[PDB]
Amino acid sequence: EQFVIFTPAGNHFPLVANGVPCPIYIDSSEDKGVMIAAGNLQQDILQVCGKKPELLTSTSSKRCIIAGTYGTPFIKKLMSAGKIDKKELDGKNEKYILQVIANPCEGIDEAVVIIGSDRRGTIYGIYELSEQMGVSPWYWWADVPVMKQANVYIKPGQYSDGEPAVTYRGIFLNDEAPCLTRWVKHTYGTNYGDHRFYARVCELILRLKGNFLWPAMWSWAFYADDPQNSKTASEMGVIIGTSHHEPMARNHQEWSRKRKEYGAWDYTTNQKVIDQFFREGIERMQGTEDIVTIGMRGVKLLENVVKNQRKIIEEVTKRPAKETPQVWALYKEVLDYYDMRVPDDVIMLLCDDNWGNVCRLPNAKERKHPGGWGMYYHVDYVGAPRNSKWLNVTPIQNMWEQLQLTYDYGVEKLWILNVGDLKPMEYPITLFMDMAWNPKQFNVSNLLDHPRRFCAQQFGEDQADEAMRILNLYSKYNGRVTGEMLDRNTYNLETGEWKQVSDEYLKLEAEALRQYISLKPEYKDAYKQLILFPVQAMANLYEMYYAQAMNHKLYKENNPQANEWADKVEQAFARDKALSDDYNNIMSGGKWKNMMIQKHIGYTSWNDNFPADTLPKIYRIENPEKAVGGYVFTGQDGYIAIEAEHYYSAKAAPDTEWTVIPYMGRTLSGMALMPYTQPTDGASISYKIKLPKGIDKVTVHVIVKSTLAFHDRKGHEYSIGFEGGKDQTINFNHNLNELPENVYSIYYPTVARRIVEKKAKLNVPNTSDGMQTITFKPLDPGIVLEKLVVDYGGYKKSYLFMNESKSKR
Amino acid sequence: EQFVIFTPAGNHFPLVANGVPCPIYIDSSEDKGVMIAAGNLQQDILQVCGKKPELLTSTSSKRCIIAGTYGTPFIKKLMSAGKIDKKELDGKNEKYILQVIANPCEGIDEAVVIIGSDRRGTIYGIYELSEQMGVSPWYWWADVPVMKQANVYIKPGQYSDGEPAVTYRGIFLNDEAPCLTRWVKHTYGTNYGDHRFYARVCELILRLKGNFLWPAMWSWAFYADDPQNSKTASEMGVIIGTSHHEPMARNHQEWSRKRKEYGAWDYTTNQKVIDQFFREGIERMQGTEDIVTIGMNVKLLENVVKNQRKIIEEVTKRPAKETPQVWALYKEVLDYYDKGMRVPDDVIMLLCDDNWGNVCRLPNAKERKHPGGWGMYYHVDYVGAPRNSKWLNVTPIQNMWEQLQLTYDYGVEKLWILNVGDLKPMEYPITLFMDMAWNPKQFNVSNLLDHPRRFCAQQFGEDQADEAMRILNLYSKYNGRVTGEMLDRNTYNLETGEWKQVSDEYLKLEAEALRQYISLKPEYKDAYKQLILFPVQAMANLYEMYYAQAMNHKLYKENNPQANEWADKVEQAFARDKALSDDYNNIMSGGKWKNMMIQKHIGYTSWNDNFPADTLPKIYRIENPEKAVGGYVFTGQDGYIAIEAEHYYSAKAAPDTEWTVIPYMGRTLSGMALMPYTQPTDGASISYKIKLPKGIDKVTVHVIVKSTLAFHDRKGHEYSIGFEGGKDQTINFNHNLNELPENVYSIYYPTVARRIVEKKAKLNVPNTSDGMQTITFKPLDPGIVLEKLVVDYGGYKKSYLFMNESKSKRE
Ligand SMILES: O=C[C@H](O)[C@@H](O)[C@H](O)[C@H](O)C(=O)O
Fold first, then answer.
1. What's the rounded Cα separation, in Å, for the pair B104 and B113?
2. Ligand 1: distance of its center to the CA of B400 in Å?
3. Which of A37, B285, B551, B591 is the most exposed place for a label (fewest CB within 10 A)?
4. Which chain B residues in 648-677 lie under 8 Å from chain A, judged by CB atoms?
5. What's the angle, vertex CA B459, arms to CA B454 and CA B464, rounded to 5?
């Protein structure tokens, strides 16, 4: 695989040495596609080493790069210069051989030689070299830097990716408004995708070793909007197709724009016009490799359409229909129809369910279909049950798992990926393309090596593992539920599931942020696009909805903590906006402005009908300073853990106030009678609980601050007991001193941990009462009550004394 | 309070206008301390505006700053001219008045005037002006940037911090090796703390408005190592003391270093030498404001004190009461005092916290009349039982406040001295401590957090204050739970999710600190790292290390090869701990703080750091983890059994297929699928062994498979699920997952978007003699990916992740 190294070494070809690149020889007979690729190679080398290689007029230099395409005597001489068997490329599809060859031809001492079995092979060779020299396919589309190199040497040996397993390997730009469309407008000034735009797309497809494109078709018409569109793709070597409901090489919008003139999209009543519309599509794609969509939705009718479309193809081409590549999509009713006559030569394009699951795969008879089978796969969708157009939400595993299946069932003629706006599907696109190239090189053991190599490529070797880990995780997390379908109820609040997934995503963000700040500066934009932004956007969205669910829970409980969670919803909502603003406007100098504007907060339907991202509903407790006391707890799972601030009522001693010390202690806060200069006589603080009826004993754990015996050598006491029962008086610190028996056995162990936990076994006075009241009475000043746990079988020893039990006030 | 503003305004004094600072006049009569402070003021102004104010030779400039100290004739003349009453300062302690004054003296049209009741007051005035112009006390000690200003104006009015509530307000550099000691050696090129180092310390103390210092005494001797030490402190205006075990103004090391000559630290047998050692301490500190530690059976201790005070009188030719003295009551001594030990009236009785921020003893109402007053020695760093805390700040904001307010309310107001360890990273507690000692009654529970908020505003700017304060408060609280040294895999409860909770929560805090960090203007990054980010990251990571270690041990005991991942995480976090500290030491602030963050903190088995180095916590790895598959047995708890599909007991593949784990596949752990999908599944099964309570006769089993569709056969995919000893229930999980009108919107699209298919099967539990059940999943069609099973017998709660996996072990 890896033939480029970045240090000089003997019997290694010096492609760049001491900053100086060798020149490039392309024979002038080569297709313009090869030339375009060679030109990009030149530029890539310039990016790599700082000097532009010369494009040689003739076979004259000691060391150079030679690229060309099988079928030429120049290339024959070169293949027997040396020792490359014709059978390595003869009749092969989209294959290159890359090899350092000594004395390749008279006037050249040594060359790295790239020979394609056809022009795309040659292109793929060229781009393989470009890629291995450190120009990612994503150098432009995700601002992946080209690491500068003084030296670039090529290993001896013969290098090939072989032939692609899947014949046509493509993306479909779709769901393209508003992001791609406004981005294109912003970047190119055009209210359509013009050839400058499609030149970038096509360069990307080819660098990814794809060869196929369904252009954007919502409001654009690839063939019609810019007469250079087709020529650009075609000369670069990208095969163009149309989506499954765009027959006969016409873009949907060519009809829609002239609907009043064309009239009805109905074959039974408007056939002459539709046939002619069709005919013109075929005429226009003659001379190209484009694949012709057949069929039509306005069974004997559909066959007649297809019969007629194929006649039209024959009339236009003066060739049998079989010689024009065709695809018939088995998209909906049509699949039912098929379960109908389809000619042998036609690619039967099967569809996923729009969510990455294949619906139908051919059986063993079906697989004998000479035209082959296709798969149209989604990583972006607008439709039921809800649009997924925001972030990548395709788990790496799921794409792999269904594509391996797809290939194993003999679907190998055509793979086409709905990529939405292209960004931010950069990774799945790459996986898709690599899998279409060679699905059998992938198995469960090595799957993650793919995102690993991708991350090595995008962010460097030293970042690959950790970036891959995060890429894999965010893809998984996002697979769970799309941002659009995520809301306050997706996850279970009461079980801790929501907190778990929210905390987990934030942990992933922390990690992504560590990685981000560790990057060399030139990787930051790519990492932001490919890793950090999706992670932060989703982690924050999670927290928003998590905080919302908490807000609602606590609001129903009349607990003024609801207000904090409301703040968090507002903050996260604002953060969502700041994150996208940064992606659009700041990142990459605003190169991707409008690529990240998809509405995602406010869906009440499958479609994003609603105007804009909108604040999830939250509630606030008015006068939260007064919303204190009145807490009643319901025991669950055998215990009641009570944060001391959640008292039912309290009564202060004279010249004192029960005071909440927020954050005090290990958990929520502390309650203390203040000031400490006053006796506490008659103060108490009471907690109301609901035990299951019948529980007759509890062990109450009382957690106070590790206050020491500062006022009175006897130490501090409080009493704890049920209303209606006997109060136990506990002296919680009389042993917290330096006396030999105490100093190591209890004193130092205790004080370093800042709390004192005392247990009181209490008899429940009447086990028939609905509520019990536990009352804490500080008998000495300076006692800070932090927590109580009423254990009736379920308490598990916990440093935080367990999650607070259910309550409401 | 705030008298500096940063725009021009009428009736406001232009201290800096147009980038140009007005000059400074200090009368020649002023103490050198004031001069030193005025010199720093000059520098500070230079930092702020870019131009160094002139130190005027004489009272000749239209506008200038004038600072001086009550009692000089120059200041006398100045106050009896518009319009400052003598009573505002006469006899006041460490007070300033700062006031714009018109025609303050012959030759000056207008001045901002700072008048201290004494030289420290003046100094504090000066530094108040520095601070309000934007020079934090932490400008050097935590690299807090000085926001440049073209214009700095002073509000009219009279400004004062009053008198400090607590007379002596100090820090104790302690536990100082290896960090402070090596940092000093590295920075000052000395093997001891010299006067240049102590000048920085003293500058910090004075800018914080403290006045007191117990210098580092482990391997250094402040008085002896550099003869300029004492002079420097003394002339700056910092009072020097020694720690409670260093009587009579001798540093402990002065004894230790001459222990052969000396020799026994025993008053009963080596009194002549010890008395002389003492006498020399008192001779040496004459001329200074230093406070003399006294003390050293009860009759013996009284005799020592009697003799120390005779020595003080002999040396000073004055009554002992005129020499400030402090006698620490900890341990036996406190009992002696209770038991009835006579302490002379003039002595400051220094009470001690428990080394962990809790006061041990406060004076009662009678005791509080002690004329010498009372002291509190408070710790935010400690080397001792039960275990050293000398790594990070671990003092919750609330705790320092809560005990210090108590301390003050009980009339302990002569002397507050804070053990600060290496000083860094206790920057915040030190500030809180100093501000509280200044004025404890300024603080209450309702405004407490405004203190760290102002601190964060000051250090990181206004726009960062709230969020930095929030993190500061939280990390301080989190650290208060348990010290890094005392934290280990057993601190938190693993089984309840507590460990995960606190680990995840700290990492969330780090995420937040990181957001904040990367939002900062670049000049704040070093200070924020020192003050917020590093402690947060260091602790969050430490938490994860120990959390991962606990998980490792749990899973290892279960013979579950997942243990290995957790082991990786322990190694990684261990390595991260090192990277974090390396950055603090070497990269942050250009390596200014090299060696300040080298404390050992991973490896404690006992109270002291007497182990060679931070060391990898013990982890265990399952050898041959690819073979450590199957053999899982689950124990139901809480009314359900949630089973990740990979955790099967046994499996049998169909011919030419292999049960294959697809890691990460699905919503939780992974997926199990018979591969490849080109083969019929005839006879394949995968079985899970569970322990139900024997009373259970029916369960609803939720079977979670990937939303695979009917790709091979229009009938769709089936599997069977059932108990060994019971009937296998066949479920067709996707026959309805198609575009047929009945299905397309009701079930098809709602299902596939969520990537899974959950089917419930009510199963009867067959009666087994073992109490064990085996539940068996049989894919009858290719391409089925089993992800999870939940066996619900009353406890299942509908959950998107189908609830935390139940307890299991294998083999
Ligand atoms: O914790 C402090 C160090 O262990 C000692 O040098 C110190 O002298 C004593 O333990 C103290 O804390 O005052």
1. 8
2. 19
3. B591
4. 660-665, 667, 671, 673, 675-677
5. 75
Domain end: A587, A621, A655, which one? A621
Q: Residues 6 or more apart from B647 whose CB is under 8 A from it? A: B560, B632, B634, B669, B688, B805, B808, B810
- Residue A152 and residue A202 in one domain: no
Residue range(s) defining the domain that contains residue B173: 166-443
Tokens representing A16? 């760049």
Provide the 3-class DSSP secondary structure of residue B519: helix
Residue to probe by mutation, ligand 1, list B379, B382, B608, B610, most atoms within 8 Å of CB: B382
- Based on the fold, state whether residues A504 and A571 are members of the same structural domain: yes
Both B292 and B155 in a single domain? Answer: no
- Cite the DSSP H helix spans in A557-709: 562-585
Helices B427-438 and B450-460, packing angle to 10 deg? 120
Chain centroid to CA A496: how far?
25
Cβ atoms within 10 A of the Cβ of B126, count? 29
- Does any ligand 1 atom lie closer than 6 A to the CB of residue B243? yes
Check which CATH number belongs to the domain holding B725 and give it: 2.60.120.1620
Helices of type H across A85-227:
119-132, 179-188, 195-207, 222-225
- Which residue's CA lies nearest to atom 11 of ligand 1? B382
Same domain, yes or no, for B258 and B337? yes
- Single out the residue in A621, A653, A671 at which a domain terminates: A621
Q: What is the CATH number of the domain that holds B128?
A: 3.30.379.10
Q: Kindly report the CA angle at A122 between A121 and A123, in degrees rounded to 5?
A: 90
Q: Indicate whether residue B174 lines ligand 1 (CB < 6 A).
A: yes
Residue B304: which H helix or E strand, with range?
A: helix B298-316
Method by which this entry was solved: X-ray
Contact at 8 Å (CB) between A392 and A424? yes
Asked if residue A170 and residue A157 are part of one domain, the reply reads: no
In A, residues 563-622, which contact B (CB 8 Å cutoff)?
A: none
Please tell me whether the peptide bond between B386 and the residue prior to it is cis, using omega within 30 degrees of 0. yes
Tell me how many domains chain A contains: 4
One DSSP character per residue, B5-16 reads: ESS--TTSEEEE
Q: How far is the CA of A591 from the centre of ligand 1 (A)?
A: 59
| Nearest CA-CA partner of B703 in B750, B742, B758, B748 | B758
B389 lines ligand 1 (CB under 6 A): no
Return the bridge partners of A756, or none.
A704
* Angle value at C-alpha A671, between A667 and A675, nearest 5 degrees: 140
- Ligand 1 neighbour B293 (Cβ under 6 A): no
Distance between CA B159 and CA B567 in Å, rounded? 60
| B220 Cβ below 6 A of ligand 1 | no
Phi first, then psi, for residue A91 (nearest 5°) are: 70, 5
Residue A98 sits in the same domain as residue A198: no
Contacts 24+ apart (CB under 8 A), B340-346: B341/B298, B341/B301, B341/B302, B342/B302, B343/B305, B343/B370, B344/B305, B344/B309, B344/B320, B344/B372, B345/B321, B345/B370, B345/B371, B345/B372, B346/B320, B346/B321, B346/B371, B346/B372
CB A98 within 8 A of CB A113: yes
Query: Cβ B800–A675 below 8 Å, yes or no?
Result: no
Same domain as A208, residue A176:
yes
Question: Do residues B48 and B134 touch, judged by C-beta distance below 8 A?
Answer: yes
Cis link prior to B782 (omega < 30° from 0)? Answer: no
Q: What sign results for the dihedral spanned by CA atoms A517, A519, A524, A527?
A: negative
Chain B hits for A660, Cβ within 8 Å? 445
CATH number at residue A229: 3.20.20.520
Same structural domain, B256 and B401: yes
Residue with tokens 């606030």: A620
Q: Give the Cα separation of A718 and B528 in Å (integer).
A: 43
Q: Which of A496, A711, A752 sits opposite B386 (nearest CB)?
A: A752
Domain CATH for A463: 1.20.58.2150
